[PDB]
């Protein structure tokens, strides 16, 4: 930025870009070095990314150059932290956590279920035998 | 088996040795104490239907001991859809005419559901093949229960991952291939119809049944499995027909 | 129509890891598969439009395992569907390092300390995110540009500075080990 009484006081990175938004001449005539002045101007103009917090369910937004990376809360994923793991209860998902049958129920609970010689437990996903030798378990080995 | 491992007696409680007229047939694999699912194929040359056996409790050939059991085979089916001398629809329910007794020794494995099967054991990478089949490619088989540990493939993962040979059957939605290609493990010939069972959970599952494959542990090939899967309703209703008064029957599929 | 996806690409940042794909879907959801070489498969991101699938949760379990994904095509309702395999991904490898960003400086005499801030990563043990030095070791090493060079196996540069006069940083992340993707975008520049 420009404002004549202000342009008397001599060039300074803090007052003409810190402190106020610079153009690349403006940069490139305190750095003098092309070099120098690409190093900086590739943040310095690059922005920031996070600024329109796209990290949503109290994720926290690092800015990259033209991009930024989301940290999650343990119950999100996503590039966004958009995805709840609480509402991927589904059997698909690691067969919906149960030991045996998985049975998916639209507008409710998934439920869990066992194969004959089987019976669900309190937890309503583990299965256990409720005859001597249940199928798929082998004897000399439990 | 070639490439495997003996499955310690009792570790394989299962697997079932089928017979016809003494000789060794075929494997097969105990879903319950009345039910045996083996391979359609191992029933292409039989003529003598009264004289099947199935052996359970079986671990070495060469020795009797208390675990087998033996019982007559009352009845075969076999999907009408099935061809002799084909690959498509290789599976057969046996009916034993009196039941086994559930020891330490002889225990059935689970048959799954096919959705379970379809969208959870389908995706478990390494299931266990076994059999008193050849050791190798067109070699002698084996005295004691041999057992292999194989990767399931998708289907496409599968052609784009074997030789092109000529004139070779499809591997149609009936068939899923397992194993390795290059050279080192694959089930075999004498292997047929026994299990390919899959553990989930702490319990193991019916998932495919040894059907067929170019040569045993050919390189540039894997070992190809019946679909159990698809099979689910078909088994399930036969199980709970009445039996008839001759051994084969060809049941419709679906 | 059931297309298989294509174009399948791994995009990671101290380990955040995106697989996308092509193409938009018509009519058709996708489900993502992951696995090591000989685990089972892990599905993600169940009947989804997105053409993108977030694989960090999966990844950040061992950082240096080498994951395949697929993606699955699913006609629009809900043998084996059509899909397409991504290519192998090896996070310890070839995980983007995240641009830095210094710290401090602080003249403790004729020399200067740099410090650079601790770069997290998405890695988690303590219900805490790991930094990158904590994931990679001596593995990773910081280097700075001043005005020439310096380097540094921890997070601090000690480097000796001409009396009275100002000078300017920057800093970049560096696996050595590494011959591609071997360097992290400049921190920004600060100056004294
Ligand atoms: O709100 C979402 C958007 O926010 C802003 C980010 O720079 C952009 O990448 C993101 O898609
Ligand atoms: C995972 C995120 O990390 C950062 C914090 O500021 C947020 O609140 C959240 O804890
Ligand atoms: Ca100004
Ligand atoms: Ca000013
Ligand atoms: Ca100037
Ligand atoms: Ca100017
Ligand atoms: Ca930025
Ligand atoms: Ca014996
Ligand atoms: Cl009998
Ligand atoms: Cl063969
Ligand atoms: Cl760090
Ligand atoms: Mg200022
Ligand atoms: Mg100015
Ligand atoms: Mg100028
Ligand atoms: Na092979
Ligand atoms: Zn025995
Ligand atoms: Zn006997």
Redesign the pocket.
């Known amino acids: 930025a420009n404002a004549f009484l202000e342009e008397l006081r001599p060039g300074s990175l803090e007052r003409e870009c810190k402190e106020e938004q610079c153009s690349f001449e403006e940069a490139r005539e305190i750095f003098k070095d092309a070099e120098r002045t690409k190093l900086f101007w590739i943040s310095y103009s690059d922005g920031d990314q996070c600024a329109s917090s796209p990290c949503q369910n109290g994720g926290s937004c690092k800015d990259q150059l033209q991009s930024y990376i989301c940290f999650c809360l343990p119950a999100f994923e996503g590039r966004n932290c958009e995805t709840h793991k609480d509402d991927q209860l589904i059997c698909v998902n690691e067969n919906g956590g149960c030991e045996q049958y998985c049975s998916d129920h639209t507008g409710t609970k998934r439920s869990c279920r066992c194969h004959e010689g089987y019976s669900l437990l309190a937890d309503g996903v583990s299965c256990t035998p409720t005859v001597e030798y249940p199928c798929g378990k082998i004897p000399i080995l439990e | 088996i070639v490439g495997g491992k003996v499955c310690p007696?009792?570790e394989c409680p299962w697997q079932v040795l089928l017979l016809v007229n003494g000789a060794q047939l075929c494997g097969g694999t105990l879903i319950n104490t009345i039910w045996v699912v083996s391979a359609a194929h191992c029933f292409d040359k039989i003529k003598n239907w009264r004289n099947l056996i199935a052996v359970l409790?079986?671990?070495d050939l060469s020795e009797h001991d208390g675990?087998e059991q033996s019982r007559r085979v009352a009845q075969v089916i076999i999907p009408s859809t099935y061809v002799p001398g084909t690959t498509n629809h290789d599976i057969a329910l046996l009916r034993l005419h009196q039941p086994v007794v559930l020891t330490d020794?002889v225990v059935p494995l689970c048959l799954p559901e096919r959705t379970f099967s379809e969208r959870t054991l389908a995706f478990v990478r390494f299931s266990l093949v076994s059999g008193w089949g050849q050791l190798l490619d067109r070699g002698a088989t084996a005295l004691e229960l041999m057992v292999l540990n194989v990767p399931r493939l998708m289907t496409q993962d599968c052609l784009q991952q074997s030789r092109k040979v000529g004139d070779s059957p499809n591997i149609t939605e009936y068939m899923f291939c397992a194993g390795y290609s290059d050279g080192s493990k694959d089930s075999c010939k004498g292997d047929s119809g026994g299990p390919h069972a899959t553990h989930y959970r702490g319990t193991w599952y019916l998932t495919g049944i040894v059907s067929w494959g170019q040569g045993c542990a050919t390189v540039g090939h894997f070992g190809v499995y019946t679909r159990v899967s698809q099979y689910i309703e078909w088994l399930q209703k036969l199980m709970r027909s009445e039996p008839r008064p001759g051994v084969l029957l060809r049941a419709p599929f679906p | 129509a059931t297309v298989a996806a294509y174009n399948l690409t791994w995009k990671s940042t101290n380990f955040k890891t995106i697989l996308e794909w092509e193409p938009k879907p018509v009519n058709q959801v996708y489900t993502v598969q992951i696995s090591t070489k000989s685990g089972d498969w892990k599905s993600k991101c169940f009947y989804t439009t997105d053409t993108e699938c977030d694989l960090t949760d999966e990844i950040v379990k061992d950082v240096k395992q080498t994951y395949l994904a697929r993606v699955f095509s699913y006609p629009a309702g809900n043998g084996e569907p059509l899909y397409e395999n991504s290519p192998e991904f090896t996070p310890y490898l070839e995980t983007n390092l995240g641009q830095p960003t210094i710290q401090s400086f602080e003249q403790v005499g004729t020399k200067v300390n740099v410090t650079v801030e601790d770069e997290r990563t998405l890695v988690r043990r303590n219900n805490t995110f790991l930094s990158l030095r904590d994931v990679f070791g001596k593995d990773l090493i910081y280097t700075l540009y001043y005005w020439k060079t310096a380097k540094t196996n921890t997070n601090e540069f000690l480097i000796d500075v001409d009396k009275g006069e100002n000078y300017c940083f920057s800093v970049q992340a560096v696996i050595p080990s590494r011959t591609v993707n071997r360097k992290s975008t400049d921190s920004p520049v600060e100056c004294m």
Do not use: F, L, V
């Open positions: 007696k009792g409790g079986e671990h675990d020794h």
